[PDB]
Amino acid sequence: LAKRIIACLDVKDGRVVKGTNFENLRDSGDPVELGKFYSEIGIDELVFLDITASVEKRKTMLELVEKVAEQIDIPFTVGGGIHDFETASELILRGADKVSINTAAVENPSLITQIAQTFGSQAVVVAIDAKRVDGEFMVFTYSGKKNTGILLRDWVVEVEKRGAGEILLTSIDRDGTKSGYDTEMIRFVRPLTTLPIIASGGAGKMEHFLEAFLAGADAALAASVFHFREIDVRELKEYLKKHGVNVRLE
């Protein structure tokens, strides 16, 4: 299939955390306007990760989804503290195409199956955060605070067995840096699953996307590089197409 370029928007209280540099926008911190803009310049999908205070989180995330769904015509995933089926269901019904689950899936792997049974595997994105620990790739939960003691290899296989549709693979060893995607980790996971893999963490330049796709990623996610205009989406797709990557220029 064609490779996908995905923009991730960290949101809180209906706003983009740290804002952006797109002066052309009426509101450079409006996640809906920014998402709409991205869909017009070449982004294939969007991911919205919410960190709103628990008391207002449920309603805030639902309002965001409703607005995004009517303004943008590309697929979008919503995530950030989705801990059970009822929360995932409300968000999908309100307009999200997919939900991302991470800590809740590790603690209860049947949650993957519960969501997939009603919404299909394609609606379930399992976000897997991993890091090297004593020579082994380990799965971490609670935003990278807890080493679960579960090997990446075993969790990847279990996630597909439970019915997930896609894996959002973030290397904690590269996330937050601009040194490039963790291609060794992507190549490690590639043969263990038939599911689409979204590479996440470490993007700093267009060549990093080419490397991640050669490593077997089906999609490449980034945030800050796009928001602060370090990388132009249109230029990136042109670059990737130039070098043999099947991206959508349509």
From Swiss-Prot:
InterPro entries: Aldolase_TIM, His_biosynth, HisF, IGPS_HisA/HisF, RibuloseP-bd_barrel. GO terms for cellular component: cytoplasm. Changing residue 102 to A: No change in activity. Its EC number is 4.3.2.10. Changing residue 129 to E: Weak activity. IGPS catalyzes the conversion of PRFAR and glutamine to IGP, AICAR and glutamate. The HisF subunit catalyzes the cyclization activity that produces IGP and AICAR from PRFAR using the ammonia provided by the HisH subunit. Belongs to the HisA/HisF family. This is Imidazole glycerol phosphate synthase subunit HisF. It comes from Thermotoga maritima (strain ATCC 43589 / DSM 3109 / JCM 10099 / NBRC 100826 / MSB8).
